[PDB]
Amino acid sequence: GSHSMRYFFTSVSRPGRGEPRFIAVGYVDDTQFVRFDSDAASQRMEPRAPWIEQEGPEYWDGETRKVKAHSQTHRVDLGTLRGYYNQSEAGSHTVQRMYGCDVGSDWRFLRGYHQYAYDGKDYIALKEDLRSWTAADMAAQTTKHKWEAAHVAEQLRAYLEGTCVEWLRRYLENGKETLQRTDAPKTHMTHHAVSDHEATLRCWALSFYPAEITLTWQRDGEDQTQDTELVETRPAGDGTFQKWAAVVVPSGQEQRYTCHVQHEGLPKPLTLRW
């Protein structure tokens, strides 16, 4: 299927406490492969997946150079934005950036993105055509004007269309055994009596990869959504994921109900009954 690379950057100001905190992580699909922590001792870009260790010392010396340049720029942004929004110097404020590429099943460029947040909401972003900006704010329009003048869009496009996808492919090759695997969910159902009238059915999906998965309830072959509950998909700690859905049924009516599980690793979707 299709694949992605994504970088996540967080800068948090802390007034009185010296320099801002800056965290950076890199992903292919649902697997993290690099990190940087301004408060860690290394002061280098660190590996987080086995297969990235195939990269040479110029890789690590480049990535660290660039990640420190992202931090430095995000340190200047916290101060620029405080100005743009006429905020005090006493609160804590957050800058977030994310960028990367999607490729389809043929490993070719599908989509590219590059977007900025300030304090939990959009600030500025690069539109799908990768040649123009969407300012979320009157305040963002200043930023947009500066980037239009320096041709940032054009250099970002060259990255997203080119360098992004070229390196994505290269990771996919190098970590084939990890990144191109599919681990199908292990499925079971459980039963817990709430009253004499009602029972909770819970349909489990454990140890799967990738993280995407659908769980749906049917009653008598029809899609059932009422009196159901579905948790957010949660990391197991060993690179696989977990999820469960639950429905509350009337006593004696358990057999009407089916759980349906769709996953890259289930060619035929699974139907579980009680």
Binding site: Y7, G26, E63, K66, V67, A69, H70, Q72, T73, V76, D77, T80, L81, Y99, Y116, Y123, I124, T143, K146, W147, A150, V152, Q155, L156, Y159, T163, C164, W167
Partner: peptide, 9 residues
Amino acid sequence: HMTEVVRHC
């Protein structure tokens, strides 16, 4: 592989 673009906003 990160981008080289780091312009001030």
